[PDB]
Amino acid sequence: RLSLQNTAEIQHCLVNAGDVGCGVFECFENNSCEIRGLHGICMTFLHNAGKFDAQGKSFIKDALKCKAHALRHRFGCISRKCPAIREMVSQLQRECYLKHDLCAAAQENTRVIVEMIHFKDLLLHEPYVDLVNLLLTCGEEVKEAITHSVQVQCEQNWGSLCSILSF
Amino acid sequence: SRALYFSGRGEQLRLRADLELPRDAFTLQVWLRAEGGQRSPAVITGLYDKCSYISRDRGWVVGIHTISDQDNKDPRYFFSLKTDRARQVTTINAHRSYLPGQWVYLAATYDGQFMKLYVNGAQVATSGEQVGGIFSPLTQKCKVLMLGGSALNHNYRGYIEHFSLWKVARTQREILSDMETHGAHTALPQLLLQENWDNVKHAWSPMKDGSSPKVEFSNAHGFLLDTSLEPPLCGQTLCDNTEVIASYNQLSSFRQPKVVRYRVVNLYEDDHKNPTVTREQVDFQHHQLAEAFKQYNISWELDVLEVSNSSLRRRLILANCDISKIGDENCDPECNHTLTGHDGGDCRHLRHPAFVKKQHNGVCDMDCNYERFNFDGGECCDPEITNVTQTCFDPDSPHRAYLDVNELKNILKLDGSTHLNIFFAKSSEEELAGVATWPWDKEALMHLGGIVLNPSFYGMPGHTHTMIHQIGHSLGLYHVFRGISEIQSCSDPCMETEPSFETGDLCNDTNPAPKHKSCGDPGPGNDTCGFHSFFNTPYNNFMSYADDDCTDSFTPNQVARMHCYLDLVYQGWQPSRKPAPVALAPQVLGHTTDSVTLEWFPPIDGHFFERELGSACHLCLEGRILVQYASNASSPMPCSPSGHWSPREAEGHPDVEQPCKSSVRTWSPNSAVNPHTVPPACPEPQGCYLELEFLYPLVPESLTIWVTFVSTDWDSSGAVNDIKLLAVSGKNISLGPQNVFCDVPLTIRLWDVGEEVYGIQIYTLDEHLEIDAAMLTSTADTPLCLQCKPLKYKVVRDPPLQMDVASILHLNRKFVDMDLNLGSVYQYWVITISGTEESEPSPAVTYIHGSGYCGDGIIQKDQGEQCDDMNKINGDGCSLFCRQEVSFNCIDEPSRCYFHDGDGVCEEFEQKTSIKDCGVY
Amino acid sequence: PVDCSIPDHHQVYAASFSCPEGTTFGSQCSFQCRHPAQLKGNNSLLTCMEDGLWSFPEALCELMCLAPPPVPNADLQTARCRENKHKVGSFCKYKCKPGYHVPGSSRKSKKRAFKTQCTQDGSWQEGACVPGQCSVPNELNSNLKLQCPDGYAIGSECATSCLDHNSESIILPMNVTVRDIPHWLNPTRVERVVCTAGLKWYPHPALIHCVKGCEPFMGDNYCDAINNRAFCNYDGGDCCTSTVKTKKVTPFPMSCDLQGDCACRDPQAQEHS
Ligand SMILES: *[C@@H]1O[C@H](CO)[C@@H](O)[C@H](O)[C@H]1NC(C)=O
Ligand SMILES: *[C@@H]1O[C@H](CO)[C@@H](O)[C@H](O)[C@H]1NC(C)=O
Ligand SMILES: *[C@@H]1O[C@H](CO)[C@@H](O)[C@H](O)[C@H]1NC(C)=O
Ligand SMILES: *[C@@H]1O[C@H](CO)[C@@H](O)[C@H](O)[C@H]1NC(C)=O
Ligand SMILES: *[C@@H]1O[C@H](CO)[C@@H](O)[C@H](O)[C@H]1NC(C)=O
Ligand SMILES: *[C@@H]1O[C@H](CO)[C@@H](O)[C@H](O)[C@H]1NC(C)=O
Ligand SMILES: *[C@@H]1O[C@H](CO)[C@@H](O)[C@H](O)[C@H]1NC(C)=O
Ligand SMILES: *[C@@H]1O[C@H](CO)[C@@H](O)[C@H](O)[C@H]1NC(C)=O
Ligand SMILES: [Ca+2]
Ligand SMILES: [Ca+2]
Ligand SMILES: [Ca+2]
Ligand SMILES: [Ca+2]
Ligand SMILES: [Ca+2]
Ligand SMILES: [Ca+2]
Ligand SMILES: [Ca+2]
Ligand SMILES: [Ca+2]
Ligand SMILES: [Zn+2]
């Protein structure tokens, strides 16, 4: 259900916005298919990139580049219907992060990734959900760390409801 | 006489410093044939200062640049000048966008207080801002006169012939005299330069980089009796012209009986049962058609076509519906229908979440057959599970239950060039029963054109005059309520305020009427604008929306339109082999003490050669040059390996109503995709390409491409990255990037191509560029046009020619009468002989030898001459028929016409209309 | 009366105008050619004419270059250049004296001759003519390591390595320590050390400190502060707009100040020109 005018403006965005940084993700936001969070992933990663180590700075150099470039191409003749777009974005996350070894970089900066991930931001944006899911299969120690943080944040924000859902 | 061709790639000339350039006053005079798609700006010639390190704008420049610089759209001739003493540069322009491929006498003068620009001798611009001399004698060595472009690569592409430069300003009579000499050479004291290009190196040295333009033999300076007759503002073809249509109106010999064949497409089941229309329908409708058309000299020959195809018969044929609009989640009532899934579900909402269980069931039911449920995943479109003809509602499955008439027309591939095809559909609208192709479309004679009707409204008592309405549409008749209900707005420039030949339905005898269904006179307040009430409306005319019980007649002007279009376009339908007549009376060129010269127009259909079936000569023009449009068209399917595809909108003659606006009648890379799919970007630097093939491969001479729309942003590549000529032997000559204008057809000359070219490939990096059509013009005496015989004209005079002339026949459309007596009245008409069958006589011209006429240079006001310029060319202000053109005022005798709407001087008759000069009234 | 207005530089180029009588019809403003432009003609008065535009000048301020200055250690080759009459664009050839060569000449071909041009402002374009064993390195930096495959014999070369693989062993100027490095200073890279005949290491290990080498992020369109220094290509031109390929500056991380460390520090940028 991607609006035709919305599609036109996004298409003109991509050919103009540069690869580096996240000018690309900027106006892929506000899309008619409600897909939000790519630009948030950019800002979260870029702001917290100062806390990453040498390997982490490499990962942020090249994973953001993969997603920018791939969203400039996979947004080719993909179906105008929303479910196809959500799948295209999801596959961007999986392929870009896995190709660039998300697991080991996250293992080097577990304490950082825990700070970056927010329970609130997790619910608002689907790309965040794919990010945390890929982290869960990136080492038992890291997955344990993520579980600790997510339950405490959910418990504070939801009160007894979080404990009810956390069987 | 020789002419320079500037290829636009860097060939420039520079006048040698031996000549004393003019300081105080000057006059440039150059014949030129500019091509389409120039670089903006394109300096034809200019005076430049080579010493001014800071202000290069000093000096003057004559060239072609776009008015409305934002979205370069309107390329006009221009004259810029900045004297050494002035503060700003001053630019004046022509009245209209230049015409590519036409010889134009561009003359520009400056007398020291008034700079003026003349196009074909009619003063089109004037400015008094620049005062004083151009440059002081001290700076005389610092001025260089350069032709073909500036040193800044403001290059010009096209022909330049007989450059001339005076050191005085020439009044309009002097420039007109110099134009009529047509390159004749003579030395005058005020002549600095006169160039016949016999020796370019003698006077002009090429600019640096050593690229000099080529020197051809000029085909001609011009042609007497300009035969180019443009239709009016509303009109579309030569039959909308007031002069042409007057001949069909006044004369009764132009409406002789004509038999026109029409074919009825009757679909059938495989067992030859269940007709789409019963034989009673065809017989009854044919009888009613014959009765209505009997009195108007049109009789229809009935051919019935039985197609026994259940796979076509059982499906629902749709009219006015577009398959792309089904399932787009936007409600489309015209594609509503039971077998289309109510627009594929766009127009049918319900408690959808209550149907999740029915998914994955493996059996078709009803609720899952929609686009948001994805049509049950193809269970319903499977012939094995269920029954497609009532279950396969999807617009993508080839087994869908509905077609549209465009696909039905594609399937049948009927010969539309010899019959009027009557297809049958299901018109959902209560307004019309179908769509009839206009005579001025591509498909008028192709397999995709004809008439689509509703079988429920065909041959039924009370519904028979819907086919006669549609037939009138297919013969060029507009709706009588055009101009009020079919106008764009109340400010439409040719809305029919009063009965006229140039507004509305282009039929005077049909009063303005609104879109009204009852055949009483419309009531007060039934007007969209409400400016005037309607009286004596043609409520009973076939072209009105009244019921079949009251519509009974065509007005005599509408009958004239139908017969004009039966000679212009539909010569193929009629079995009669009478060639089309000459529409206009033989014009009088000039008279001597003992003779008179007559030149007449070609026959109205426009063909100069005898019509032979199967030959290519119906495309040949005078001089045996073959001009053809893109027949094939193919362009790779985007984001698909191979894909092939076939963009039929870029075939045939150009059909875009309004250039520079996005249209559906073009090839656009974005249009190549499924509308339910994000359009890709054109591949990097090769571009999306459109292949156009031409029916008759031949040695090309010039290529014309109608680039209707261009996105406005990038550079000067013109969005046409490359053009390749597919040679027959297998080569492919690349022509390099071309500059295009959105409203001027990109013209290219192919003098370098020596091999037979069968097609082109228009590459583009633009995802929004739109190509309307192409055109190949052959060289003179092309092989295919040699054998076919030419049309021959026979001239008949009243009184008859004294010697027993057999008319000696004719081929040149020029007759010199030697036998004349002073003061005697003579009448002339021409009869077109195509083999041995003579056409109807052309309208007569009455020339009284020794007296005046139209085109003698004397304004005989009694004859009706509003102007007279001793000349038979339109566009010089005074029309061919001795009538002032719009926005041109003509003074003196013979007439000197000038463009007054913005000549820098307000006048008496300009006060009420011209705000540019006289201000707000 | 019609106003010709104060005459601008457009009436006569490279001159100043005095208008004692004003700028009205019939006025006459006298022009003087500014140095070094020389007046050529017989009148220098511009009349304000009836059309509203200053009259034509009867004379012009010709631009010219006087005798070029004698370039040190160079001999003029063009005799005509010895005059005091050279128009704009005139070339003068100089030949360096023996034992001298033009700076910027390649080693394979030392050009002993050059040319200069009379530039538009009346000056001349510049041109010149340019003519046992060794002690164990006990005093070493913690991050610095020395590898000696050939022992410590006089003349043996020991490789200087750093604990950080992205750190370079260098020697800074005496006025600049490890943390005192300015943006404009490019330290001397040191790779090997040689013990001389004086029983001493040269350069001394105590003078070598492992300074953080820049990360491989050079030339990735990401202006990062660490690589933004003269030691390595100012982050490969990422931090300066003209040098970067994308023509836009996106500092990494975002928090880096565009007016601070991530500011364009390369002095060869067009913004610095
Ligand atoms: C029909 O044709 C006859 C000649 O056969 C002519 O006299 C008459 O004017 C024509 N009428 C119309 C309406 O075309
Ligand atoms: C009928 O036309 C269709 C095209 O729509 C074609 O596939 C088929 O072979 C034709 N004949 C029959 C008997 O269906
Ligand atoms: C389609 O037809 C159905 C049934 O006639 C109707 O309810 C629906 O409004 C129609 N869709 C349109 C008008 O687009
Ligand atoms: C499809 O329709 C035909 C009509 O004759 C009928 O014979 C056949 O049984 C139907 N098949 C299904 C699966 O409905
Ligand atoms: C046009 O029609 C009007 C009546 O509406 C009539 O008076 C006039 O003579 C007609 N003129 C022509 C040229 O047919
Ligand atoms: C049209 O051109 C395409 C591509 O060159 C070709 O495959 C096809 O056969 C052509 N068709 C005709 C009718 O010439
Ligand atoms: C065009 O010509 C070039 C050689 O100039 C050749 O490589 C190419 O295959 C030809 N065809 C096209 C479509 O480019
Ligand atoms: C130049 O000016 C002088 C006065 O200063 C006058 O005597 C002489 O005639 C002038 N010469 C020319 C060539 O005008
Ligand atoms: Ca729809
Ligand atoms: Ca179903
Ligand atoms: Ca009318
Ligand atoms: Ca077209
Ligand atoms: Ca006359
Ligand atoms: Ca004329
Ligand atoms: Ca005027
Ligand atoms: Ca960097
Ligand atoms: Zn109609």
Residue numbers in the entry:
A (entry chain P): 44 to 210
B (entry chain C): 94 to 1014
C (entry chain Q): 1282 to 1412, 1476 to 1617
From the primary publication:
Although first discovered as a placental antigen present in the circulation during human pregnancy, the metzincin metalloproteinase PAPP-A (pregnancy-associated plasma protein-A, pappalysin-1, EC 3.4.24.79) is ubiquitously expressed in human tissues. PAPP-A is able to cleave insulin-like growth factor binding proteins (IGFBP) -2, -4, and -5 in the extracellular environment. It consequently causes the release of bound bioactive IGF-1 or -2, which are potent growth factors. The paralogue proteins stanniocalcin (STC)-1 and -2 were recently identified as potent endogenous PAPP-A inhibitors and thus connected with the IGF system.
We have determined the structure of the metalloproteinase, PAPP-A, in complex with its endogenous inhibitor, STC2, to a resolution of 3.1 Å. The highest resolution (3.1 Å) was obtained for the STC2 subunit and the N-terminal approximately 1000 residues of the PAPP-A subunit. Some regions, in particular some of the SCR domains (4–7 Å) and M5-M6 (5–8 Å), were determined to a lower resolution, and will benefit from further structural analysis. (3) C120 of STC2, which is required for the function of STC2 in vivo, connects specifically to C732 of the M2 domain of PAPP-A, thus preventing dissociation of the complex. (2) Structural and biochemical data show that STC2 binds to the PAPP-A C domain, and that removal of Ca2+ from LNR3 diminishes its binding. While the core of the CD is similar in structure to other metzincins, in particular the two known unicellular pappalysin structures, the PAPP-A CD stands out in several regards, most notable by the inserted LNR modules. In PAPP-A, the LNR modules do not appear to have a similar role, but rather interact with either substrate or inhibitor. The pappalysin S1′ specificity pocket has a conserved aspartate in its bottom (D641 of PAPP-A)13,39 to accommodate the basic side chain of the substrate residue on the C-terminal side of the scissile bond, the P1′ position. Thus, the C612-C643 disulfide bond, which connects the ZnM loop (V573-F635) underneath the active site cleft to the CD core, may be important for keeping D641 in a position to provide specificity. Although the inhibited complex cannot cleave IGFBP-4, the PAPP-A active site is accessible and active toward a synthetic peptide derived from IGFBP-4.
